[PDB]
Symmetry: D2
Subunit: 317 residues, 4 copies
């Protein structure tokens, strides 16, 4: 007795009395994540090396094409694409999708785990679609999640109902349900941040990190891990607990990570996994975007760990 | 002309006038890594989840059996096996293999990169195969390398003449030569160590890290990265340049990484790469093993960066 | 624009305004065929050969567990199980599925093409499900088709609206629509029959074959082909045109092929594709079954070929 | 222990005491065969169907470029090439390879079994290489064999000492030894020929078939099978026993099949397997070639069945 993503998605579209438009959207997203996984594992490199005589771009076009053909999307927002992509009236459906096709293109050389991030907003506005229908607070996400292409490939889908983890079996190309209604730990034991920007940190970070390497109560210190690929670091934070920080160094208070297609999906997953996600001031999901490519700081993780750092931010006011 | 692992290892055996036994051993090694890689990528899990009705144990078993089958080995030293495995007299050859089947088996859940590490020695004794044949300085390695199962699968093989990186094309099951006689950068740009243990670091490590975050001139700090699996961190270090450190803290005054099957291969690879690998005190490859599961400290990376840490070491003697 | 079988099934479902029970069944057929294709192809035989220290049965068990897990079936008839499988109440749906898991099981050693054949009926009686709900004439089929595991794997599905062919891309585990709304050639140039039984043919089969080898008007003879796999031979007939015959004789006065799970599916594919299917006396599809393992004589293919044989049969009565 | 094709070719190379050049040839051939198998099974067709980002040709390109890259060949003759390919000076080795890259490419649309056939001669003349080095009788072949891309992929290799069969495990891309020192059944019970050419057969074939359908001792008739791909029909004949015939009829008094790359490799396999291969008059392997594209009649299979038919050819001279 086994549940595949295809079965699960359909079971949930039927329980929700959906017209089946979102189920086609999600089915297309499954197919594209498998085509991206195959290309990331380098199936076919023999042919470039002349056995018979770019990845982020190819991933981009695969996602845009497979979702345009689902007849379920009107507005798409991409990492690469400068402007929002408006789908032809012939293929329009009502969802808005914001995605990062290949998190950490800078990391493929060294074969670091890379991933795909996505958030689906339902178009709310009636009139002719545009950038505006994407500019919605993350609290308004219908579904979001990520595909991690690491040791194995995993899809994490979070919707209004919960977080569920699917493992790709590459022999038959099916995502099998492995972990269901995932909830993160209350407090973890690992902290993730790029410490080489230590000089540029704000004082609440400095204090937090010091408490984690030399606890005052004098328990154990927290282990550090920083892969430097946002899907790998957040995935480990979800599975194992802890806190992942990508705070405001002197790339202004904007932070580095983008709001619509990196911070917001991850935050929605955290919050459905019963964790927290914040700028340090506001919850990430409540920011109303000014721009699609807008950046935002983020700290996310196990409930207590995030709370502890918010209290320290509070003392430097 | 495309070069495949199988072609390269043959050509190299021809040039060295070897009787083929070693090429058999490398051939076998190749078949084992492809088998680990498929199992790691989770081909066939659907069966586990009842579609029709640990991995490290499986990995250990794969490596042991394929290697006994080359008729090229007599002693195998395994991470997972307390004592050295003495090969059956019928399948005995003159090589001694030390391997770590799955560098960091605990990184599977988190879907963090994992890897296999190996070192090959030639038995130099007349005496029957015994644990003693394994206790040879890493300066006696005939071949060493590793396979990283990351976003893609790559095997780096370091031999007498150099370091070449072969990527697996999983469609035809062939490793293609992608990088030929790799040389690591003089000076890197990233440092790698678990800073949670900052409570227990010796003053030289402490001074070096400080120097990377607050560079004594006006310089840009180094990026920090620590994935948490030796093969992923050492491979990013070989490819991108920088330094990787696992010093001895007090909870492991002799280090934590094992000398015969983690340290010496990685040290042999760095040295053939044109980088350095030390314990802070001596060179890793010159340490004479006493125990097959002996731990050693290791600092390895680009020559300049490793030398800054050594002058810092000597400055506190 | 790419149409995957997942997209296709789902769209057709929306237009037929089904409650999605059929789409779930049809999605489970698809997953079942992929798992069986991977097994036919010997992915993993190395493990049977000790790298780490019955296909028919297993395919039987993959079709039953996956069909049961769709909650869309109530009675299943297998070639392999002497009785109808009655789905347990909590998984019962409204469809009856008649299947042959691996047509031509004896072809696995010689390695010729084998396939999976299926037919779907709707249970329409209110009595507690029984073997009886499967005894419906082929004319009552909701959907029928096959999966051919040949040089490539292809799934052919036929429903009331036509026949469509899906090629498996094994690199992503998705079936792609390659031929849409297939019609068979009007007159073919290849006949298929096992001529070793020439001794036992009735005179109409004997006259038809003579007329194919020595054509009455001065045409070139027909080519001859007979693979020995019903799915391979009927698929060649569908795409290339011609006639496939497995009539009755001294042995097998009722024919060899079984009505519920080999004859009727292929006969529904042929009539939907514009070809004929006959016993020599009735159209196969109108034969009301008396037993689940009942046999029938079958002749199918291009309408002008099948007719020329029915005429010869009539001129011998 | 398992024996992979790579371990076998190497140990037989070590025993024959060769310079490693022919092992480099056989290893290269094994790599082109996997590359052809992946392409044939249509891995990657979604890209042709627009997911964003003639087989005959590619099979020919893969074989030529992979065989060139082993630096072990000097003349190659292909089904697809009008003239013998002379290898460039710096890649010249001493072997002559005659190959049929994709036996029966017309089976592709219909998805029927296809294969690749090869025979290897040693250049024996002293002149700068020419098609002349290919015009040697099949009795001079060093090695010959075929790969069949059927329900699974199998390579069959015949060398001085026997016929061995390797199944492709496509999960690891490794050929595993499954049946060693194959000998064919003395008498089989299947005959194989295209009987649509009955108005063209000579009287010995005509009588031969009559006797197989109407056995004069009233024993059982033989079963007929004809797939239409030489590799499938001939492989079935090796495995299950019987006779395969494609004689002269009117496609010249010389037959359809070609001597260097279809007839000689298969006849060689049959003789090392213990069967026979004749044209009706002489043995196929003693025909001295005149053109590289020369055709030949061929009859092959179980010794007793071929002899029976030779006695009928004798009764009509
Ligand atoms: N497959 C799905 N699983 C979860 N809920 C869904 C599913 N499909 C649709 N629903 C819900 O029903 C609403 C309408 O879906 P739809 O009419 O198909 O566009 C969606 O916006 C979802 O909230
Ligand atoms: N493929 C290979 N490439 C590198 N050196 C090898 C190769 N095969 C053998 N040799 C060298 O020759 C020595 C003996 O080879 P062997 O006779 O195969 O045991 C080895 O210990 C190596 O130093
Ligand atoms: N995926 C499908 N493609 C074609 N027709 C379908 C499909 N799903 C349902 N139907 C038709 O609609 C009827 C009701 O479907 P259902 O309620 O799912 O049992 C079925 O018996 C079919 O005749
Ligand atoms: N791998 C092989 N298995 C069978 N015999 C071989 C093998 N390699 C070489 N030999 C024999 O030795 C002869 C010369 O080998 P070579 O020097 O490699 O060209 C060949 O023509 C073969 O008859």
């Amino acid at each position: 007795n086994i549940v595949t993503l295809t079965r699960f998605v359909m079971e949930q579209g039927r329980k929700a009395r959906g017209t089946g438009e979102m189920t086609q959207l999600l089915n297309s997203l499954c197919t594209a994540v498998k085509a991206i996984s195959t290309a990331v594992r380098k199936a076919g490199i023999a042919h470039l090396y002349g056995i018979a005589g770019k990845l982020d771009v190819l991933s981009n076009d695969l996602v845009i094409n497979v979702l345009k053909s689902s007849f379920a999307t009107c507005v798409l927002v991409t990492e690469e694409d400068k402007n929002a992509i408006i789908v032809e009236p012939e293929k329009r459906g009502k969802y808005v999708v914001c995605f990062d096709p290949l998190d950490g293109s800078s990391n493929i050389d060294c074969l670091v785990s890379i991933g795909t991030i996505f958030g689906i907003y339902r178009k709310n506005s009636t009139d002719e679609p545009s950038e505006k229908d994407a500019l919605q607070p993350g609290r308004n996400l219908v579904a979001a999640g990520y595909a991690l292409y690491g040791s194995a490939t995993m899809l994490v889908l979070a919707m209004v109902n919960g977080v569920n983890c699917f493992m790709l079996d590459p022999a038959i190309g099916e995502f099998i349900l492995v972990d269901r209604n995932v909830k993160i730990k209350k407090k973890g034991s690992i902290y993730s941040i790029n410490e080489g920007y230590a000089k540029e940190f704000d004082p609440a970070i400095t204090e937090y990190i010091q408490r984690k390497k030399f606890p005052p109560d004098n328990s154990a210190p927290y282990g550090a891990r920083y892969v430097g690929s946002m899907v790998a670091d957040v995935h480990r934070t979800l599975v194992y607990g802890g806190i992942f920080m990508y705070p405001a160094n002197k790339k202004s208070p904007k932070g580095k990570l983008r709001l619509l297609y990196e911070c917001n999906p991850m935050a929605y997953v955290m919050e459905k996994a019963g964790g927290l996600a914040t700028t340090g001031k506001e919850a990430v999901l409540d920011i109303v975007p000014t721009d699609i490519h807008q950046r935002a700081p983020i700290i996310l993780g196990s409930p207590e760990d995030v709370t502890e750092l918010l209290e320290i931010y509070q003392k430097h006011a």
